[PDB]
């Protein structure tokens, strides 16, 4: 019921652990490199960010949703000088299954399926009710921030950057909408998850379009044959719902993780699905 507050480590992280230039990834607001503990040799992600209180606000929030399973778990944080200018450094897990997409691209003649789909959604839903449920909106829900703890196939998807993330803070009635941002950002997975496209797309292909941005404001997204064809109406409706253009319209965290297609994946028929062949179309053009 009671967890350990936040202790900042004021050692050198160089006496526990040795720093590679090896960049894992870019984080909006730091660089993501790989490190090693030196006693276990065991592979960890360094996330260094300068000790501005937007910093402090992003490890204390990551701290508080590190415990979520479904949530990249935050092994130690240090409070240390680089080039005398004060750093906190974030140890995270490593997890090195990659990003979600990129795994269901690797996946070769065997064909993704609903039900996997239902279990993937799942997953990603649980983090956000975590969040929600202590008063945390992630605000950067993204295929990219989604990434699996190992390349083995029981690996757990898990959620990652919390450089945008925001506390949303005798019987009496509940009464920001940045939680439903969230609940956006479901909609859009899933819909890729389903299809291997994105529900909205620019013309031209190149970053955002003002035409895409007209189709998010309008909520103009179809669902094409034959990616869609054995697609259940059940799970649509569900889409639609997520990607209400009114914030107050979308669905709760509560309500998709109620929803039985969510909640019984088991049930969820494992219709074979174009995702995995879209996907690696996709990086071919990508790949010239």
Not at 194 to 220: D, V
Not at 241 to 258: A, D, G, S, V, Y
Request: aromatic fraction near 10%.
């Amino acid at each position: 019921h009671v967890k350990s507050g936040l202790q900042i480590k004021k050692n050198a992280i160089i006496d526990d652990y040795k720093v590679t230039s090896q960049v894992l990834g870019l984080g909006i607001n730091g660089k993501v490199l790989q490190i090693f503990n030196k006693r276990t040799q065991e592979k960890f992600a360094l996330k260094m960010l300068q000790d501005c209180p937007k910093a402090r606000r992003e490890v204390e929030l990551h701290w508080r949703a590190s415990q979520c399973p479904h949530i990249v778990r935050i092994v130690d944080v240090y409070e240390n000088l680089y080039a005398g200018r004060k750093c906190l450094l974030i140890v995270m897990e490593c997890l090195d299954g990659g990003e979600l997409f990129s795994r269901i691209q690797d996946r070769g003649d065997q064909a993704f399926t609903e039900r996997e789909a239902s279990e993937i959604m799942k997953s990603i839903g649980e983090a956000i009710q975590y969040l929600h449920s202590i008063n945390i909106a992630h605000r950067d829900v993204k295929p990219e921030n989604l990434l699996y703890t190992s390349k083995r196939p029981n690996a757990i998807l898990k959620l990652t950057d919390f450089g945008f993330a925001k506390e949303t803070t005798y019987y009496v009635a509940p009464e920001k909408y940045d939680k439903s941002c969230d609940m956006w950002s479901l909609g859009v997975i899933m819909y890729i998850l389903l299809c291997g496209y994105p529900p909205f797309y620019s013309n031209h292909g190149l970053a955002i379009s003002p035409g895409m941005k007209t189709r998010i404001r309008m909520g103009q997204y179809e669902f094409p044959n034959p990616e869609w064809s054995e697609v259940s109406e059940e799970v649509k409706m569900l889409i639609r719902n997520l990607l209400k253009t009114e914030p107050t319209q979308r669905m709760t965290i509560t309500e998709f993780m109620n929803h039985p297609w969510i909640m019984q994946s088991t049930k969820v028929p494992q219709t074979p699905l174009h995702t995995s062949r879209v996907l690696k179309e996709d990086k071919e053009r990508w790949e010239d």
